[PDB]
Amino acid sequence: LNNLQNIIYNPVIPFVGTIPDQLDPGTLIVIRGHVPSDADRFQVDLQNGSSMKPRADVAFHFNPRFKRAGCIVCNTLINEKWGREEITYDTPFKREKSFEIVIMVLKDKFQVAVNGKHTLLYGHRIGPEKIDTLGIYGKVNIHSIGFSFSSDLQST
Numbered sequence: 001l002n003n004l005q006n007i008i009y010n011p012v013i014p015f016v017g018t019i020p021d022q023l024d025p026g027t028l029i030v031i032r033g034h035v036p037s038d039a040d041r042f043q044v045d046l047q048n049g050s051s052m053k054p055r056a057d058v059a060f061h062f063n064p065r066f067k068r069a070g071c072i073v074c075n076t077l078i079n080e081k082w083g084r085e086e087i088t089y090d091t092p093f094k095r096e097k098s099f100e101i102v103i104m105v106l107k108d109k110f111q112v113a114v115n116g117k118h119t120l121l122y123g124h125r126i127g128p129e130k131i132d133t134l135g136i137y138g139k140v141n142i143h144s145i146g147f148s149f150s151s152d153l154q155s156t
């Protein structure tokens with residue numbers, strides 16, 4: 001409900017960048033982009049740091065996959081080992097279609113909407129205060145990355 005504040009337009013992919021502010025409850029991450037016609041998958045990762053080796057922990061891996069029926073895989077990476085996947089089969093992403101992802105950080109979970117329709121929840125596995133880095137990888141065109149805040153949904 002606050003005005004969007006974009007940090008970057010048209011970032012080169014893979015993108016890695018520092019998040020300006022701590023992801024307190026009510027924070028919104030807003031990502032606009034387009035799925036190329038040949039995309040197999042892309043991901044948005046909320047990371048504890050940016051190291052590639054040992055690979056930084058990923059508090060929240062949000063991973064649309066386009067083969068077969070399509071799905072979104074969510075998971076957490078700790079010390080270079082993935083945990084148990086949570087798979088959402090009702091996916092709104094399609095090759096050759098554009099999207100607006102809104103990741104809402106709540107007290108107990110992430111709530112993700114795409115094109116304004118609720119898509120999935122992911123309970124926190126590590127504290128969101130450990131997140132300082134946003135990564136975007138794979139086959140995706142990103143138009144903008146920005147941050148907002150909602151006091152309404154801040155406590156729910």
Ligand SMILES: C=CC(=O)[C@H](CO[C@@H]1O[C@H](CO)[C@H](O)[C@H](OS(=O)(=O)O)[C@H]1O)NC(C)=O
Nearest residue numbers: 043061063073074075076082083084085137
């Ligand atoms: C098709 C592959 C598999 O199931 C496993 C798990 O596949 C991983 O699944 C994770 C989410 O659980 C990440 O998506 C990850 O991708 S990564 O580039 O972020 O590291 C991806 O390989 N793969 C193996 C045994 O080799």
